[PDB]
């Protein structure tokens, strides 16, 4: 290839490339940018890097890295035999004396294989594998580094047959290098093999025995990279293959218990993982016998902040988090059986005069809370007032962890008399929300949200107090916490409901919300807590939200509109245009449904001006279930609020509702059934033409195990409603349901729903009395839940019950009535008689 004039130009350009002052390097930044699109230039780059020994390491390496960026951006462009020249030069120089040159070459190869593509370098893998065998150590190491990077980057491409089947050659090749002299090499080998465990890729699986043997042979390797890789190997293996590990299990946990205490905290982390993974397996209890008593203290010891973190404070997975996690899981496995092991530890840690210890103790308390709750109940009356005291602790990390652990005992706290625990707890938590430290602000805010979730309407007496602090936070908050503050406020709204609406409360709350609202861009993810917060505030405030509605309504529909528009654009030009992030759509639909409910009937003026339904029609057809879900919720809410604007759309909508039942998605199925139910009421007899799309499915649903409570209730309700508007189809199906219908509906509060549904079961029963006879018990018991029926409903029940009585004959009505539980048989005579 050419040289010798432009060569000097490249040399000079690279010289200026590294220069002390910004001016020169910006000028050559421009020169570089312009030249970067010409292939000949790149030929010069690889030439300088590999072939020119005259130049210093830094310069060559820089040539290589600039070339590397040139691949990174617009590699697709430059023409073949150039690219092939680069490839060849790279592969011939892979082993190189200079560590820096070797690294550059590596990143080049790596970036070419990732970018241009794996198929587009056909001979790469076989070449690297042939290089592994080399007598030159450096070539061996560079080839192995490349292979490792390649395995990490694409496992899935490698396990596919698009490459043919490379792993079939590579994996057995890798296993032969576990025995290598160089620790770097062994490290590379087991690292490469590790990518393929969870996949259960054929090559590894068929060689599994070889693998595990060589793994054991490496167990005692001094070198921490090797130990660490072995540990990873054993964790993943544990996950995928229980069988081949079983015989060696005890020795293995003996080893892991040792690695967990390892001097090098990386090895220690990778080992500690093992307990997290083992606690998921069903045989855990059996394997952990006789290692458990040591294992727990070990985990409790790893749970204090490492010294580096103690310095940094006063972000990511560390020994402490893994230990804590493993302890939580275990405490869920052993439940109350763990307490004899934990209690002594807690006794020494909790009251300790060294705050790191105390902290790790409180952490332990929190972690074991879920699994050990029952066994811990006896000790709470002593502990909780102690934690409430800790929130006042001089050290911040103590305050925060205390907030969390208390939060984990919140349920027990609200289940007790409010003045002894709940009240102090709330006062002190509120104090801590305003804490001068941000970590404590976030922890306290989260805890408090947790508490609000746990005690609802119990908060009411204290509402003003709470608001006083909450809004004040608006002034003190750095916006990282501000989001947690929104979540706190939304949770407050959800918990106290309509008690939230008073002029002073709204005047206090709204301005700062509106403030952050105005100043957030439609592109900003931080909108999510803010709108999810308003969504709940609005449902809570109801009519009192009127002043603030128009602007928020508009913004939501805009958000939904832009996201849809962007989705289609992306669909059309996916290379030129980037996909929308549908979360904005979801949050926006949420807020919308949130106004539709509690503003209901007052959105009419707004909806009448909107394309909102034209958009919803698209949302329902979206591949992403959460969108469909929010969308059907909205459909129901509008259906209630203003039906006039829906009625046009019910023709197209219904078929869509009918293909969205699909109980595999619970929330979707639910919101869709609910929606249908809301349609029928407004549609009266006009619902006639389609039952048939929905019915068979609804019956299949209400009869399905194992179906979540709410889905079943909603199903029964809408079926009842369907039978209420259109008893002619519908009702002549029963005992296909109504066992489930009744068993479900009997557990629901008395309200508009199930008033509708029961009126429907009655007008359905007039039409097909034959079906309800087989089990009439379920219906009696259902009529019996019913503390306060509407007089009409009552009378219906009377007519039906008496009808049955006279029908079946008296006395043998009573042979039937004899299996009535006391309260049932009594209420039946009391309200109806009988």
């Amino acid at each position: 290839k050419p040289d010798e004039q432009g060569l000097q130009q490249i040399l000079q350009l690279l010289k200026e490339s590294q220069s002390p002052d910004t001016t020169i390097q910006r000028t050559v930044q421009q020169k570089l940018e312009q030249l970067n699109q010409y292939p000949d230039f790149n030929n010069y780059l690889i030439f300088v890097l590999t072939k020119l020994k005259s130049e210093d390491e830094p310069t060559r390496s820089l040539s290589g890295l600039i070339l590397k960026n040139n691949v990174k951006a617009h590699f697709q462009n430059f023409p073949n035999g150039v690219t092939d020249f680069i490839k060849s030069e790279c592969l011939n120089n892979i082993g190189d004396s200079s560590p820096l040159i070797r690294a550059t070459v590596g990143i080049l190869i790596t970036t070419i294989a990732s970018k241009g593509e794996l198929q587009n370098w056909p001979d790469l893998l076989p070449k690297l594998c042939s290089l592994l065998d080399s007598e030159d150590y450096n070539t061996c190491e560079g080839a192995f580094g490349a292979l490792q990077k390649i395995c990490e980057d694409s496992a899935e491409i490698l396990d596919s047959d698009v490459l043919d089947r490379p792993l079939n050659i590579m994996i057995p090749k890798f296993l032969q290098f576990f025995k290598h002299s160089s620790p770097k090499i062994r490290s590379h080998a087991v690292a490469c093999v590790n990518q393929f465990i969870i996949s259960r890729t054929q090559a590894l699986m068929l060689h599994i025995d070889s693998f595990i043997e060589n793994l054991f042979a490496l167990a005692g390797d001094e070198e921490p990279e090797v130990r660490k890789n072995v540990c990873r190997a054993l964790v993943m293996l544990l996950e995928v293959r229980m069988d081949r590990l079983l015989p060696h299990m005890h020795n293995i946990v003996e080893y892991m218990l040792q690695r967990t205490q390892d001097q090098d905290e990386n090895v220690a982390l990778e080992a500690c993982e093992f307990w997290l993974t083992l606690a998921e397996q069903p045989i855990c209890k059996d394997v952990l016998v006789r290692h458990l008593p040591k294992l727990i203290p070990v985990l409790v010891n790893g749970m204090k902040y490492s010294d580096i973190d103690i310095i940094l404070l006063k972000s990511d997975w560390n020994l402490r988090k893994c230990s804590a996690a493993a302890l939580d899981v275990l405490a869920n496995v052993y439940r109350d059986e763990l307490l004899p092991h934990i209690l002594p530890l807690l006794k020494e840690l909790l009251f300790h005069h060294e705050w790191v210890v105390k902290e790790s103790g409180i952490l332990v308390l929190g972690a074991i809370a879920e699994g050990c709750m029952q066994g811990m109940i006896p000790y709470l009356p002593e502990l909780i007032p102690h934690l409430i005291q800790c929130l006042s602790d001089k050290k911040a990390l103590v305050r925060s962890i205390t907030c969390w652990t208390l939060s984990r005992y919140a349920h027990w706290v609200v289940s007790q008399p409010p003045d002894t625990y709940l009240k102090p707890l709330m006062t002190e938590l509120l104090k801590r929300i305003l804490d001068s430290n941000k970590r404590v602000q976030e922890a306290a805010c989260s805890a408090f949200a947790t508490l609000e979730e746990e005690a609802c309407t119990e908060l009411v007496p204290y509402l003003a107090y709470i608001l006083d602090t909450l809004v004040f936070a608006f002034s003190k908050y750095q916006h990282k916490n501000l989001l947690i503050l929104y979540d706190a406020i939304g949770t407050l709204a959800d918990s106290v409901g309509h008690h939230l609406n008073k002029p002073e409360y709204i005047q206090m709350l709204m301005p700062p919300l509106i403030q952050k609202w105005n100043m957030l861009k439609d592109e900003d993810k931080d909108l999510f807590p803010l709108l999810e917060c308003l969504s709940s505030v609005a449902t809570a405030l109801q009519s009192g939200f009127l002043p603030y509605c128009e602007p928020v309504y508009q913004r939501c529909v805009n958000l939904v509109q832009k996201t849809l528009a962007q989705a289609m654009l992306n669909n059309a030009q996916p290379d030129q245009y980037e996909a929308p992030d549908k979360d904005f759509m979801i949050v926006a639909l949420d807020l919308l449904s949130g106004l539709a409910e509690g503003l209901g009937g007052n959105i009419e003026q707004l909806v009448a001006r909107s394309n909102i339904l034209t958009l919803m029609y698209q949302c329902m057809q979206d591949k992403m279930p959460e969108v469909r879900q929010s969308s059907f919720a909205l459909l129901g809410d509008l259906t209630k609020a203003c039906f006039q604007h829906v009625k046009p759309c019910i023709a197209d909508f219904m078929p869509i509702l009918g293909t969205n039942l699909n109980p595999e998605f619970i929330s979707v199925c639910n919101n869709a059934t609910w929606a249908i139910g809301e349609i029928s009421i407004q549609m009266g007899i006009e619902m006639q033409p389609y039952i048939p799309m929905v019915l068979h499915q609804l019956v299949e649903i209400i009869n399905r195990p194992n179906t979540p409570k709410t889905l079943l209730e909603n199903t029964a309700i809408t079926i009842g409603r369907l039978g209420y508007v259109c008893p002619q189809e519908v009702a002549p199906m029963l005992q296909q349901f109504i066992r489930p219908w009744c068993t479900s509906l009997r557990n629901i509060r008395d309200n508009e729903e199930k008033d509708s549904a029961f009126r429907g079961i009655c007008t359905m029963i007039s039409v097909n009395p034959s079906g309800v006879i087989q089990d009439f018990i379920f219906f009696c018991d259902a009529v019996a839940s019913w503390i306060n029926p509407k007089d009409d409903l009552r009378d219906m029940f009377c007519k039906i019950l008496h009808g049955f009585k006279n029908q079946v004959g008296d006395e043998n009505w009573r042979r039937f009535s004899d299996q009535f539980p006391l309260p049932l048989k009594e209420r039946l005579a009391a309200f109806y008689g009988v």
Binding site: L363, A367, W404, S446, L483, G490, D494, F528, S667, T710
Partner: peptide, 19 residues
Amino acid sequence: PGKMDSRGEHRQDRRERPY
């Protein structure tokens, strides 16, 4: 027996936790 919110869960995932 209303709509399903999924919002409280989002709030949960955003909450502070030690591990």
